[PDB]
Amino acid sequence: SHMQIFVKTLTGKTITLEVEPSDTIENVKAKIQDKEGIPPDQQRLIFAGKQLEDGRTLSDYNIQKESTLHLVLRLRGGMQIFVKTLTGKTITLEVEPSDTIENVKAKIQDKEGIPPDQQRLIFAGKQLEDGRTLSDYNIQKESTLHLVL
């Protein structure tokens, strides 16, 4: 069933979009390009604190009628970081600032075989939340996170 959503921009501006629950995130970001002029691969859509990811759909994030999305600049550029288990060995990961902490765990599970529900990442004495990105924590390049455990 058709649906209206609202996208607030950093420039004190709220855009109305005509969408469907089946619409993919990339399909929505394209609509935002036509209206706001921002390249899809540079848009970071936020909802309830969760980053809407490409390949998914609005329904996957339970986006209901008249929901409000926030648009910010998706920070781009490949770089490497390090993850040292508290034991501990160190592995090197190729990431972008816009990669979520949940994404980082999936990459750790890919080479260390560690299930995400067992992974707890630390940096600067803080616990990194799955929903947020590396950017949100100012994780510099060459930084070393601490996996627990």
């Epitope: 950093l10 002029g37 540079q42 600049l73 920070l75 600032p97 950017s135 949100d136 390049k141």
Partner: antibody, heavy 118, light 108 residues
Framework: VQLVESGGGLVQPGGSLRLSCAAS????????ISWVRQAPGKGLEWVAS????????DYADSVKGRFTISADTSKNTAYLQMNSLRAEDTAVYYC????????????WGQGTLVTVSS | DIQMTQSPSSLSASVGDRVTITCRAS??????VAWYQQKPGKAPKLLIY???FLYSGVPSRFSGSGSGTDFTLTISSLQPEDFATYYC?????????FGQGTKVEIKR
């Protein structure tokens, strides 16, 4: 909402100098910060950019090697360390904010004059 | 480096006139072009981005067009405050590059 610059002034050839670019009303979260200079009677030239929240950097060839762009995320302030300065480094230095799309400067600071002379 | 060539380097016009500046890229840059306005002793301001998208706070008399290598900045009705220097820029690739500038002066 603006960018406030300082640190500019008078320095001799081969000398060093540091510029500061303090943010007001906005944070460096989800932004690139750039330095653009303007020589007297000249146009605009991009000096360097940075992703404050990752420390990633980019420099123009005519300056890549002598200058260093850094940021203090804690205080939403960007810096520009200028070493081995030259007469042709004389210009007005702007710091600009990008938060819409890469390389587009949606906010420019007041400006600070850098002059390299004996 | 991608070269951005503006034309003309200077143009004279009177208030209320319709003005059009052209920007040429040395190669294809799709719609990744931005326009800035600057004034003596002042910092530049963003006017147009992604070729034809108006930035916040910018009068609707400013308009952008074009894609590829040929772009244009149009001012529907020149106003006393519109008399300044205009720079185009490509945000298509690194390093970002500006045009030489086009100064719009008053006619008399």
């Amino acid at each position: 909402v603006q960018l406030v610059e300082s640190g500019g002034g008078l320095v001799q050839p081969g000398g060093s100098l540091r510029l500061s670019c303090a943010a007001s009303g906005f944070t460096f979260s989800n932004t690139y910060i750039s330095w653009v200079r303007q020589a007297p009677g000249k146009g605009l030239e991009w000096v360097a950019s940075i992703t404050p929240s990752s420390g990633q950097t980019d420099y123009a060839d005519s300056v890549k090697g002598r200058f260093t762009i850094s940021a203090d995320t804690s205080k939403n302030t960007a810096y520009l360390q200028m070493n081995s300065l030259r007469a042709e480094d004389t210009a007005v230095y702007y710091c600009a904010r990008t938060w819409l799309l890469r390389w587009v400067m949606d906010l420019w600071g007041q400006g600070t004059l850098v002059t390299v002379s004996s | 480096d991608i070269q951005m060539t503006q034309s003309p380097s200077s143009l004279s016009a009177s208030v209320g006139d319709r003005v059009t500046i052209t920007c040429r890229a040395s190669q294809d840059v799709s719609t990744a072009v931005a326009w800035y306005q600057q004034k003596p002793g002042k910092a530049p301001k963003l006017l147009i981005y992604s070729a034809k998208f108006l930035y916040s706070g910018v009068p609707s008399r400013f308009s952008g067009s074009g894609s590829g290598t040929d772009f244009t900045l149009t001012i529907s009705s020149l106003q006393p405050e519109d008399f300044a220097t205009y720079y185009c820029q490509q945000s298509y690739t690194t390093p970002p590059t500006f045009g030489q500038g086009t100064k719009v002066e008053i006619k008399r």
